[PDB]
From Swiss-Prot:
Binding of substrate, residues: 19, 39, 161, 163, 199, 215, 276
Gene that specifies this protein: NEU2
Natural source organism: Homo sapiens
One of the record's GO molecular function terms: exo-alpha-sialidase activity
Active site: 306 (nucleophile), 327
Lineage: Eukaryota, Metazoa, Chordata, Craniata, Vertebrata
GO BP field: ganglioside catabolic process; glycoprotein catabolic process; glycosphingolipid catabolic process; oligosaccharide catabolic process
Enzyme Commission no: 3.2.1.18
BNR-type repeats, residues: 109-120, 178-189
Entry function: Exo-alpha-sialidase that catalyzes the hydrolytic cleavage of the terminal sialic acid (N-acetylneuraminic acid, Neu5Ac) of a glycan moiety in the catabolism of glycolipids, glycoproteins and oligosacharides. Recognizes sialyl linkage positions of the glycan moiety as well as the supramolecular organization of the sialoglycoconjugate. Displays preference for alpha-(2->3)-sialylated GD1a and GT1B gangliosides over alpha-(2->8)-sialylated GD1b, in both monomeric forms and micelles. Hydrolyzes monomeric GM1 ganglioside, but has no activity toward the miscellar form.
Top-level lineage group: Eukaryota
Name of the protein this chain belongs to: Sialidase-2
Gene Ontology cellular component annotations, sorted alphabetically: catalytic complex; cytoplasm; cytosol; lysosome; membrane
Primary enzyme class: hydrolase
Amino acid sequence: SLPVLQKESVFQSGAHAYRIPALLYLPGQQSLLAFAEQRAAELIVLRRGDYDAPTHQVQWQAQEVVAQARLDGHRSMNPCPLYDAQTGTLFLFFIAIPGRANVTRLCQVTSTDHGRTWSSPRDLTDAAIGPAYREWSTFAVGPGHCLQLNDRARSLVVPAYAYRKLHIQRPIPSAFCFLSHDHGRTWARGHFVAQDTLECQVAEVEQRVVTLNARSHLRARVQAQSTNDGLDFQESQLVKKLVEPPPQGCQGSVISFPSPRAQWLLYTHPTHSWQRADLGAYLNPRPPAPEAWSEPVLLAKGSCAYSDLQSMGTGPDGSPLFGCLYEANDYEEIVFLMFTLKQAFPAEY
Ligand SMILES: CCC(CC)[C@H](NC(C)=O)[C@@H]1[C@H](O)[C@@H](C(=O)O)C[C@H]1NC(=N)N
């Protein structure tokens, strides 16, 4: 299908299994960081990748284990990378569940050497959630990259969802954002969006809004936008243009990038309505506008699942360079795709 700069496998089954990928680009470093769950949900691993423009290809180093990203007697999962341009610090957020009552933990480990080494995990659970904790059974972050805003305080936005016990029934899940306006010092919990929303990610648009796209039991993605930097999500509706597979849907990813014409959205997710196959790439020139969403362009044929996008700057063709990470061939491996806006949306460049 679609010709791309590079298509390679960064993780593969054998010794252990790997799922739930997360991608992070380090602008002033030309580098990328591929995160994932190393399953015997056990530990989180990481692979550093140095991108070279001339050879149109990224060079991946050895695989490593974020030793710090874990709590004793707790499995880890849902790695959510995020980079603070302001301080140049790195944040890897995750979840720790022990080996009806909530026992989930929110944790973060930071790096100041571009992810070469990490700190001690900070358990943000009690200060970040508060009394509402007991009101849930479980929650989670990402999985995937998080967001930093363009507001005064260059706030940090972490996408998440909680499994609300609102009743005589199961628990209902709703997405929300963990906000910090002091570079991961303090954390607050923004409000929820429509019910029955799950794994999600956010991106900033053009005055300034936060578009949040979430997984859903239904047959179409659920999309909500915010005007108060993620605190609230006024609008919120089904985007029939973005199919969602049968079971309980599947995780997608979305990022923003500068329009060649103020940003546009790129989104990745399986295109098959009846399964997790044929990973497409949808483009939105008039974000957030739900009907502005284009048809998808086939990125990879066959079985596909969780994915994560990353804007990588300028491609060798002059167009926006993108970095994709997705689960393939029935979780047998994880692939790193790299292409440009040109190759994907030739009519749009
Ligand atoms: C129970 C809530 C689910 C998310 C909608 C569930 N996530 C967690 C943290 O348990 C995911 C889901 O069951 C699996 C999938 O859809 O592929 C992956 C699975 N995620 C992980 N094993 N990390």
